Structure formats: structure tokens, C-alpha cells
Amino acid sequence: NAMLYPLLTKTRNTYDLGGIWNFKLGEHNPNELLPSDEVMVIPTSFNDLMVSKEKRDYIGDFWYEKVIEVPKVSEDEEMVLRFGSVTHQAKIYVDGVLVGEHKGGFTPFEVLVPECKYNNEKIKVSICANNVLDYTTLPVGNYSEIIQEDGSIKKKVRENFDFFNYAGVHRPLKLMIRPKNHIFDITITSRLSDDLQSADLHFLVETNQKVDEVRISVFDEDNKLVGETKDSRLFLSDVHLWEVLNAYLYTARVEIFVDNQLQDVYEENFGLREIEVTNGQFLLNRKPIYFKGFGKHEDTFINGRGLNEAANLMDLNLLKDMGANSFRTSHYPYSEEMMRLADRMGVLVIDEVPAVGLFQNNGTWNLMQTKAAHEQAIQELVKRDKNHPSVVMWVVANEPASHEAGAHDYFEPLVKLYKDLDPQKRPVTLVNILMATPDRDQVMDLVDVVCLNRYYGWYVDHGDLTNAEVGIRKELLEWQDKFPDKPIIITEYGADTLPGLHSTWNIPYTEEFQCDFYEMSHRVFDGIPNLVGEQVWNFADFETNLMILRVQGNHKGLFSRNRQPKQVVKEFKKRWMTIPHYHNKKN
Amino acid sequence: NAMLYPLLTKTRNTYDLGGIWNFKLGEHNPNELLPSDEVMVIPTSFNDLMVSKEKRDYIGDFWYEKVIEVPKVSEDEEMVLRFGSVTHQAKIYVDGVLVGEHKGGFTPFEVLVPECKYNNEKIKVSICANNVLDYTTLPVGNYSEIIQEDGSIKKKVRENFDFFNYAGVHRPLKLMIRPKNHIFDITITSRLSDDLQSADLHFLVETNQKVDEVRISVFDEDNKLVGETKDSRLFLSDVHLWEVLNAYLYTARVEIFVDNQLQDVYEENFGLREIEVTNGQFLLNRKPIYFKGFGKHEDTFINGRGLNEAANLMDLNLLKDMGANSFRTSHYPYSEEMMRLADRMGVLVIDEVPAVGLFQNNGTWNLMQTKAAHEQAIQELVKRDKNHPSVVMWVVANEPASHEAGAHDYFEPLVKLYKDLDPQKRPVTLVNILMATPDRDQVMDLVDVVCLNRYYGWYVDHGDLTNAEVGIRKELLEWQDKFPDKPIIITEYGADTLPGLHSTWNIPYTEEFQCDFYEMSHRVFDGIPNLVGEQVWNFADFETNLMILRVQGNHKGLFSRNRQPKQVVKEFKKRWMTIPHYHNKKN
Ligand SMILES: [Mg+2]
Ligand SMILES: [Mg+2]
Ligand SMILES: [Mg+2]
Ligand SMILES: [Mg+2]
């Protein structure tokens, strides 16, 4: 498939197809030439590039089209289109001919270009993207159609989630020339010695056709050979562990040979680190970890949900400076670029599928037709990210109706799928909503870590921190009592805060209240032995749809959308730099 | 004169003439009836009540007029109009007849209503206010006239000071019925015993005609008689001192008798407290005091420079809560209501005449014709405020050209005037500008306390706190060395800060930089033994005129103009509540 990150090797010619494409919101015949009347950038969200609300709110098919000159392709090579993602659905066309299709707006997929065109001068690539969401998609949307009484159908998507339905081609599109017989997947696992000084490496290299020899060379951060094998197994000594905010990455250069000549070559990075959840603790390299960080969003001005590597590094640098150590890919898999960056910077990542909105506005599980999309999402995510040492936990869903009948039957095989697919068998969790109190919830028994989204003082007991403190402490103790050996992580807690709003009277929406809210929250958290992590909502302000509770988007960010700090940022840096990354609160 | 605060006694009927007056910007004949086409409130600034810039920027004569019904006036009584102030100049008319005049917009004055009208049904009061400032007025303005080539003269005042030229009747106007033979002044002094348990009280009661007996009764805060005398002197035991943020006020009920019957009665409050400047220290009740507080302004939205008692109490409550203890009446005498409030709340007050702008945009002292206005300002201020225990120091000028030739000759008799008029002989100071470095300044030898307005890091070394810290420390040590026994007080230091502006890179105008600026400043201040006080500029944002350095007024306030706090307020409360009111930094 297309799990492997696009690389430039001697056997793989990878070209970027980013830039300006002919664009159109509406119907189009791919047998016809899309004019240049409207253009659009790849990669980016198209929404904030539209000046009018009408075109910004567009729902349905929208087209990208461009004539691309064909490079040299040899006899033993094939040519594929590798999409980082297309949001949400896509049909791919080459010279008007349907050639590929994908559903899900946050996972990569590749599409084969017909071999009969490899000697043509040019090919026309048409991308039929679609941003419709319903009860069969992840994330879940409320779809509806209304006739404008002009004879036309106007589509509308009422989001079942708290973020703007940004759409377009958000991630790099690559034109890849690769051998027909190539490496399509590489799985790297390791068993650390008792003294943590040695490691037993296992490699699973998958090819689409037979090969005579699989040679694997391992290089350290000084690019020095530390091991080589033809048997896909290798013992290492004097190893250097991948540590929190102190990353060490090895490189596995995988070469396949046929008839004593190079067939294909690929390089996959990996890190040596151990993960275990036991006795109400989260262990990294056999030491108790305290999560400090953020729930994030792929969201910036202009680009919307589009990839911005500079934004990734800026955010992660701010994360490091504050004394934080982790973040969650809420509420969808982020770019591969972000994951690889997290690997390099030693940042812990809670990896998450777009399973948000599984909640009817009871009887949620008699209406959700998301099973197929949910299974694919888990399969794609694990296959894409399993080699990332930064990935330390999987999320099966964010705030589903886990208190309703049918919830357990829905999630039991999905939790199992994570365990079966992941070669590291990392802990999986479910991000719990406030309606599902310990007594009502019927799904948390399936997961390894209890993740809670709680807003005592904002949603419940609004502006009443006194009564809020009692409520949050009361429920946290209930969770600890119901699951005595499961670690607890707060994955969302915050208060909307507009920059410039001030008061001496602890007023919600002001910068002072955000400080007060978090100060109260932390006082409670520190008294719960099983609470091993705190991730705020959100890192930065982000765009949402139109509703009365949203004051031009979500303002629960510690930073503004332009990455400028709010008053509370200074307070978090004090706390997070006092609490070490390795912090045992069992003592 | 009109030094005594208007009171309601059995011999004094005091009526408030506040409310709606017929108003007109421009020429008017007081022999004629001003129509009600335009109206204006007393008391308030008229400026922000004008919707257009033209009328708001008006310079010249503007009129208030109202027909007022005459109350009962007996044979031995007279009727006067008592203005808290009129800004800046005023001519008062009764039935079209000129009857009083005053120059100076921040001091009280009374005007006698002609006795031939006491039996009339009504009288017409006309107030010809004027807001022109020049080189003969305090504060100093740059006056100019330009012909609009329509045949008319347009006047313009270019302020020589950093605050908006708000004008109008800013303070209560009273209609006072009093005996012809009345008490027109009361001076209260006291000598504290060596054990601070007793006090020798001296009273100087002034009447305009002869009286047979002056009886003075003294009551404590429980309204209990603690002493009485006919000889204007009284010894007190078990006295209760007036303390910083712990005020104790006594009341002197003064009665004058003629032929064994009551002629007039008035009550004047006073406090028992001792002040002395010696050995680089400011002593209150013989203990080293550390000033913590603000340079302020009589400034609020809507009312402008108009009296707002609620605003006074709100500000003083904020002052008390932060751990502060003092403020300065920059740059003009404030309302009597504010002074009396400060007496009640135990807040230290640095009292200041409108001597701001004595600086040519060298040769300042060959152009300033302010001597007469300056002498009157000192006379009026001392006579009005000498009995206030809150008043602990006088200011002779704010940022004058004290480095130019002629400065010493100008200020020497003015400093002397303070010492001669004030029965308590309180310390007097001069607020020094940054251009007048210790080597250049030729006036600070005259004063008892060195007051400095310094902006290292904002005006000099803008956004360079590193080089700013060196500069401020260097000069402060020079001042301490040039005047080894004079206490130093920072009367202005701050940075413009717009609410909502944020950055991680110590950027000027942001809320973070304001914190950084003050943090650096305090580090320096704490290393200077002779520095006995810190007063920030400003307490709150305030209105100024139009110039490129002013982003809609002055934003150096710790609070916004609506009295909402900025980020730095929290930092000041921490520091000011750690440093006691009585704090000796000689140790
Ligand atoms: Mg909460
Ligand atoms: Mg703790
Ligand atoms: Mg300074
Ligand atoms: Mg100190």
C-alpha cells in the first residue's frame, strides 16, 4: 500500500506535484479541460482562500486539475500518485479515466498511473475531492439537502464536532517512480535488555514480488554502521535509548537484491524505547512518566488544516520551552511530517483516529453506520505510524456516547484491532466525555488508560471555581476507585479566553480567569495519585463553525491562533518546569 | 477667601447648583438670555460630550447660564457662589453684571452675590469659562491664532504637557448662605510628645470681623468630646495617631460668639502625625517609610477631568488592595473630595501645583511669564490643603527645564513660598526630567526630596532592558552621590501597554514587556539605599492630544481607563504586599 513515507533514493524518483492547480467548486467532466478561471494551491485548505461565505461554505464535489509532464520511466518501473491525504473523499482521474478512490480525509493513499501512458508526453490528473460528512464517515457529520426552489440541490453538513470542516488537499502530493518489485512496508520492533544496554532488533520487510536477498544496514546518529544482517534480525550493544525531549534515532537502510543486483532501497528511522502501563502508572523506559502538554489541532490562519512544517516546529519549540513533553493528535491523524518531527524532538504523541462525533444530538449506536470507516482508520493509522517511537498510545474514539447501550459491543472489536495490528502492542485509550460519569460509562474497562475531557468551572459550574473544585475532585476519586490500576490522563481542560479581556473579579473569558481555572484544576490533579498526565485544551485558538457558544472559533488556547501567548502561558511554564518528565506520584 | 470646604451647618446653608445649564461655545452677551439650544452638565468636562471633533477642539470663551431661584437670606447673612474650580479661566456674572474673576483651572474661589438681589425672586448666573493656555498660565500651553480667511479667528492651544486639555466646570458649584461675620479660615497644627502618647494642639481661627469668644470643641472618631478651649490651644492625652492605611481623624468644631449668641459654626477635620526628612530617609511618625503607589490623573471616560467620587473610591480601594500606600496629584491639585478621602483612608499624598510645561520646545526662562500664576497656585494650594494629614509633601514643578540658566533663580523663591505658607513646613520637591542629569541640573539643591521621572528601557534604550538597566543604575548612583542625605523617589516609570498585545520576545507595547520593564526597574531600585519610594506612571490609561507617540491617549497605566487590570497588576500586588509600609533600607 502507501504506508511508507515518500523518499528520494537511487531506485525511487520522487517528485512533488505541489503548486497551482485549475480549480472548480461544482460539477465537472474529467474528459473535458478545466479552464484556469479559478485556481487553487496544493497543499492547503481551500476555505479561507474564498472571499465569500457562499464559496467558503460549499459542500459537495470540487475539482483540482493540471496537465503534468511525464518523466523518464524505465521498463522495470511503475509510476504512482501518492497523496498525503485528500479531505474528505477523493476520486482520482488520469486523462478522464477513473484510476483510484479513497475515503477518509486524514490518511495517505497511492494510485497507479496506467502503464500505457509512461511514454506519453503529458498526462492530465484530475482530483475529484468531496467534503460531505454523514453517519458513515469519520468524523461524523449531520448531512441534509434542501431545494432552493430554483431546481437545484443545496447540500449542508452540520458538524458533530467542535472544529471547522476545513477541506481540500491538505498534504503533499507526490509523483513516484519506483520499481515494480519494491519494498511496500517495513516493520521494526525491538526487545530491550535487562540492563537497557543492549537490544534485539526484528525486521519485517514486505515486497510485492520475490527477492533473493534482503540486506539491512543499521546506522546511528553519527551515520556510522553499527550492524548488518541478511536474516532480518540483529543484536545491538552499547545502544542509545530514545528519551523524552532527548531523542535518539537509528536508521535502517533496507536493500532488496535480485540476481545479485540492487532492486530497491529504502531508509526507515526507528527509536529504542520501552512502554508499559501498570499499577496506575505510565512507564517509559521502566520509569514513571508525567504527561505535560496539549490537545492540538492542525490549524493555522490562511492554510487552515493544510500542512505547515514551520508551524509544526514553532509549536513544538514552544512545547519544549514551556517544559511540556507531549501532545495528542486531536481529532484525526496529523501529517507524517509532524510525526517524524516528534520522533526527532523526543515528544510523546497520543495518536488518534478521526472517530469524533459518535454521539447523537439516546440511541447513538442504532444510528451510527461508522463501523467500516472506523476499521479502515485504525488499519491505516497503525500501518502508517507503528514505527514512530514518539507514538506511545492510541485513541479509539474522542467523546463518543460511551454511556449508551451498544457502546461496549461497538468498541470491543475496535480496541482489539489496535492490539492485533500494532506490533508493539501499545496501550490504547478512549477519550471520555463528561456525560459518561464512572457509573454511567460502560466502555472504559476495555482500554488501558483512562482519558478524561473535563470542564468543571467552564461548562458545569460556569464561573464558579469553588463548586467546580468539589465536582472535579469528587469524580476523579470515583474514576480512581472504579479502576484502581488504570492511569488517568486529563486530555482536555480549559476555558475560552479572548486576548485583551481583563477583570479583577474572576470573570470567564478574561485572561485572569484562565489562570484561575487552571490553578484550581492543578490543585485537584496533584491530590490524585493515579492521575499521571495533564493535556490542556487547547494549545492555540482554532477555527470552528457558527454557533452561539463560539465567539469566532474556539478560544481555549493557551496561545492565540497567531502563536502569541496569553497570560496563563507564563504560569504553565513555571509549573511544567518544576514537575520533571519522570515524576512518580506514588512515592 | 474660599479655602474652607463647603459645609451644611446651622449657620451655613449650602445648596448645590449642579445639573443642566444653558450652554454655548462662542460669544455671548450676559445681558441677553442664553437659549436652551445647547445644554451642559455641571460638573464635567464638556469635551467628550461633543460628538464632533470641531466642537471638542474648541478654544476660547464658552458660556454656562441658568436662572436660579433665590432662597431666604436674613439681614446678617450674605450669599456667595463657591466654585470648586473652573478650567481654566472664568468671569462670573449675576444678571449681566461682572461680579467675579479667577485664573487657574484647578483651585477653588468664591464670588459674592450683590446684596441688592437677596429679595429678588430669581437671579441669572452666567459663567464665562475660557480654556486658553499660554506662557502666562499654569499649565503652560503654546497659543496661536490663524485666520480662516473667512474673516474669523481660529484659536489653537498646543499643549506643553502630556494630557488632554479637558475643560469646563469640573467641580461642584455651591450657592452658600453664610453670616457676614463668619469664619473664613482655620489652621490646625500639633506637636507630638516624645512618647507619641500626647499632643499639643494649636488653632488659628480667622474671622472677617471681631468676635467676643472663639470656642473650639474636639471630638474623636467615636464622636466623643476629648477637649475644649477658648484660648485656641489644647493639650490632649491618650491620642490616636494618623497612620498609613490606618487613618485616625479628629474633628474640630469651631464656634464664634458675639454678645453671648452663636455667630457661626464650622467643623474641620485633622490628623495627628509627624513628618521629617533626614539622612536619606522619609520619616512618618519617626519611622522610615517606603512609598508604593502611582502618579495619577483626574481622568475617566465621559466625565474627562470632571469629579467622580465613585472613581476616587474605586481607585483608592484598588490602591489599598495592591499593597500600595500613596499617590501624586499629577499634574494639578485634585478635588477636595479626593483629598478628604485620602485623609479617611490613610493614603499618603504628594500635593502638586499645575506647574507643568515650564520647558521650551534652550532659553526657557527668558520666555516663561508664569511667575504670577505660579505664586498664586502655591498660595491657593497650601491654604486649601494644609490641614490634610494625607498631604506629606509639596511639588513645586513637574519636569521643568531645570538644567538651563535661570532655573535656580526662578525656583528659589517658590520653594521658599511653600516653606513660609505651610504651618507644618512639610518637605517640598521638584519632579525632575531625564534631560536634567545630576551634572546638568541646577535646582535639586533647593528641595528636600529628589523626585525623578525616568524611562530607561522605553524612551532611552527602547526595548533594550539590558542596556537600560546599566543606564538607570548608573544615574541613580550619581544622584545618591551628589545628594548623600536627600531621599530619592521615582515619581514616574512605565511603558505604554495596549490590552491584548502579546509576545514571547519582550516586545514593547505588549503586556509581557510591561512586566519585564518593571521587573528590571525594581531590581535596580532595591540596590539603591537612598531610594525610598516608587510611584508608577500611570495608575490608569488617560486621554492626551494628537501626536504620533500617542496611540489614542497614554497607555502607561497599570489599569486600563475602565479600571480593568493589565497583566502587570498581579506582579505589583506580589511585590507591594511583601514590602511593608514602614521599610528601612539602611538596616
Ligand atoms: Mg475540570
Ligand atoms: Mg504533581
Ligand atoms: Mg527607568
Ligand atoms: Mg527594597
UniProtKB/Swiss-Prot annotation, chains A, B:
Q: Where does D-glucuronate bind?
A: D162, N398, N453, Y459, E492, W537, K556
Ordered alphabetically, the record's keywords are: Glycosidase, Hydrolase
**InterPro entries xrefs:** Beta-gal/glucu_dom_sf, Galactose-bd-like_sf, Glyco_hydro_2, Glyco_hydro_2_AS, Glyco_hydro_2_cat, Glyco_hydro_2_CS, Glyco_hydro_2_Ig-like, Glyco_hydro_2_N
Kindly state which reaction or reactions the protein catalyses.
a beta-D-glucuronoside + H2O = D-glucuronate + an alcohol
Cite a single GO MF annotation. beta-galactosidase activity
Identify the PROSITE patterns for this entry.
Answer: GLYCOSYL_HYDROL_F2_1, GLYCOSYL_HYDROL_F2_2
What general EC class does the enzyme of this chain belong to?
A: hydrolase
Location of motif N-K motif in this chain is 554-556
- Does the entry feature the keyword Hydrolase, yes or no? yes
Q: Which domain of life is it from?
A: Bacteria
Answer whether the UniProt record assigns the keyword Hydrolase to this protein. Answer: yes
Q: Regulation of activity: what does the record state?
A: Inhibited by a set of synthetic compounds like thio-urea derivatives and analogs. Inhibitors of gut microbial beta-glucuronidases are expected to block the reactivation of glucuronidated cancer drugs, and to alleviate drug-induced GI toxicity.
**The EC number(s) this enzyme carries:** 3.2.1.31
**One Pfam family per UniProt:** Glyco_hydro_2_N
Record text about domains = The N-K motif seems to be a discriminant that could be employed as a fingerprint to identify beta-glucuronidases from the large GH2 family of proteins.
What this chain does, per the record? Displays beta-glucuronidase activity with the artificial substrate p-nitrophenyl-beta-D-glucuronide (PNPG). Is likely capable of scavenging glucuronate from a range of chemically distinct xenobiotic and endobiotic glucuronides present in the gastrointestinal (GI) tract, to be able to utilize these diverse sources of carbon. As part of the GI microbiome, this enzyme would be able to reactivate glucuronide drug conjugates, such reactivated compounds can significantly damage the GI tract.
- Family, per entry: Belongs to the glycosyl hydrolase 2 family.
> What's the protein here called?
Beta-glucuronidase
Identify the species of origin.
Streptococcus agalactiae serotype V (strain ATCC BAA-611 / 2603 V/R)
The taxonomic lineage of its organism, from the top, reads: Bacteria, Bacillati, Bacillota, Bacilli, Lactobacillales
